[PDB]
């Protein structure tokens, strides 16, 4: 089961076409599954073209020899998910899954709301300082977020995490955490989060003075 | 009857589906592989009928209208005979 495309980005109302190639078809049975953010896998299609219960009719499957394809017409934001083809074949049975296809649903560009959080008093007493910068509800996913401490950009001591695309509104959120020792944190004054994103009219900087 | 369920689970009756469909389109080894599979049920008439029932069950999606259903059901009923196997006396294909 060789699955393609690995990545897909399409707008609502368009048609998504995913394909798998079975290596062999000895007593083969083909299915397709959907993995939404946070949710258990959901059977879409079984036996190549039969639609599972609770699945809208715009999902359909077909086969042409060794090639099996899932067609998702009239795309919705809720189709944002990872899709897997599934072959059971041979005796003793063997189950193979495709490598998966990540389907993004496009939307109108949305600038991030930028928020910054200094370290808690509790954590500082523990001997460390975590500063957090949040980008909320933006699209597209590309955004450059850096910490800038007394005008020096921080590279290698921060960690970034991005949510999966929201099923309802098709946005991402992102956190950037700078972790420092107590001693290092107190050595500097100005902590600023520098953000560029296509939805912004210019780069954004949210900052706080340490001790204020 | 638990013996029957186990061998039907391991049986591969896809060749029977393909042979039957080839046969109606007329009106290579699919038939022989099908008869090989059905030969495993010759010693239990009840299990043989269950195998034919499962072929009919799995073919409902591919059949449109009673004419197509009847045309496929006739060939399925004759399939053990065409395989040189003893057929079940009573066998409802629904």
């Amino acid at each position: 089961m060789t699955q393609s495309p690995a990545t897909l980005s399409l707008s609502p109302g368009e048609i998504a076409t995913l394909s798998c190639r079975a290596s062999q078809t000895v007593s083969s049975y083909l299915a397709w599954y959907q993995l939404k953010p946070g949710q258990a896998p959901r059977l879409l299609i079984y036996d190549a073209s039969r639609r599972a219960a609770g699945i809208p009719a715009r999902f359909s499957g077909s086969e042409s020899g060794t090639d099996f394809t899932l067609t998702i017409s009239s795309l919705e934001p809720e189709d944002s998910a990872v899709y897997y083809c599934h072959q059971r074949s041979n005796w003793p049975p063997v189950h193979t899954f495709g490598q998966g296809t990540k389907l993004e649903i496009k939307r109108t560009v949305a600038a991030p709301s930028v928020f910054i959080f200094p370290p808690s008093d509790e954590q500082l007493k523990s001997g460390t300082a975590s500063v957090v910068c949040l980008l909320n509800n933006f699209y597209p996913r590309e955004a450059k977020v850096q910490w800038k401490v007394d005008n020096a950009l921080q590279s290698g001591n921060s960690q970034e995490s991005v949510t999966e695309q929201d099923s309802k509104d098709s946005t991402y959120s992102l956190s950037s955490t700078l972790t420092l020792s107590k001693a290092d944190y107190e050595k500097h004054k100005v902590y600023a989060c520098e953000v560029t994103h296509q939805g912004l009219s210019s780069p954004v900087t949210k900052s706080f003075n340490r001790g204020e | 009857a638990r013996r029957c369920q186990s061998q039907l689970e391991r049986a591969n009756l896809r060749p029977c589906e393909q042979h039957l469909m080839q046969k109606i389109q007329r009106d290579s080894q699919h038939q022989e592989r099908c008869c090989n599979e059905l030969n495993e049920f010759e010693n239990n008439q009840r299990c043989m009928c269950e195998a034919l029932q499962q072929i009919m069950e799995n073919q409902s999606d591919r059949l449109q209208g009673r004419q197509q259903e009847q045309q496929f059901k006739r060939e399925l009923r004759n399939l053990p005979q065409q395989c040189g196997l003893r057929a079940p006396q009573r066998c409802d294909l629904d």
Partner: antibody, heavy 125, light 108 residues
């Protein structure tokens, strides 16, 4: 152009287990019957057993206690296991197709149409 | 088990001779009487199935007949390559059973 070939050790100590594998080439083994046949010093041919690709088997009753066969269609292989072997088990071991074919007279016939070249197995210490 | 007995157990014949092999069975066969030819260092080769039906590729030299418990293989005109052991075999039930073999040696 379906072909068969045996593989496995040519020497087994007595009381140990003989194991052999037949590899099918030129086409999928799926939904055909397979078997093993043995030819000892006496020159006769002894049928060992038949295995279908569901894994169901029928063995020769003399060896049934000590014989077993298994199939793996994704490797296009089936195998033979014989335990507690003695000198009596020294033989040339053939893998075969147990064909149930329809002839031009529209009737179905059973016969062994495909054979491997055979592999000698010697039982001694 | 169905016991298969062949006669002669061995014979010597010349190139061009007719060779006749009889196979008797301990029980009545319905259909699947098979004949094989095993040359030295080779696996047996199917000649005839269903008592009388020639396998594809097999030369017209070889004919089979009979029914019930009484079957015969005829090589109408022996050739040097027919040096071999010939077996009858039933596949009407399990266990499949072979005859003891008929060694055909060639006088020259």
């Amino acid at each position: 152009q379906v072909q068969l070939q045996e593989s496995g050790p040519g020497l087994v100590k007595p009381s140990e287990t003989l194991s052999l594998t037949c590899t099918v080439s030129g086409g999928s083994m799926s939904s055909y019957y397979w078997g093993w046949i043995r030819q000892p010093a006496g020159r006769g041919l002894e049928w060992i057993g038949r295995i279908f690709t569901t894994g169901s088997t029928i063995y020769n009753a003399s060896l049934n206690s000590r014989v077993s066969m298994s199939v793996d269609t994704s490797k296009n292989q089936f195998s033979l296991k014989l335990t507690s072997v003695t000198a009596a088990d020294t033989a040339l071991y053939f893998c075969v197709r147990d064909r149930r074919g329809r002839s031009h007279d529209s009737n179905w016939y059973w016969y062994f149409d495909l054979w491997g070249r055979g592999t000698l197995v010697t039982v001694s210490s | 088990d169905i016991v298969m007995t062949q006669s002669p157990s061995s014979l010597s014949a010349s190139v061009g001779d007719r060779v006749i092999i009889t196979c008797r069975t301990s029980q009545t066969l319905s259909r699947n009487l098979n004949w094989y030819q095993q040359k030295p260092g080779e696996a047996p080769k199917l000649l005839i199935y269903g008592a009388s039906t020639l396998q594809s590729g097999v030369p017209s030299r070889f004919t089979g007949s009979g029914s019930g418990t009484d079957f015969t293989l005829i090589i109408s005109s022996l050739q040097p390559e027919d040096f071999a052991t010939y077996y009858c075999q039933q596949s009407d039930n399990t266990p499949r059973t072979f005859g003891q073999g008929t060694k055909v040696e060639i006088k020259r």
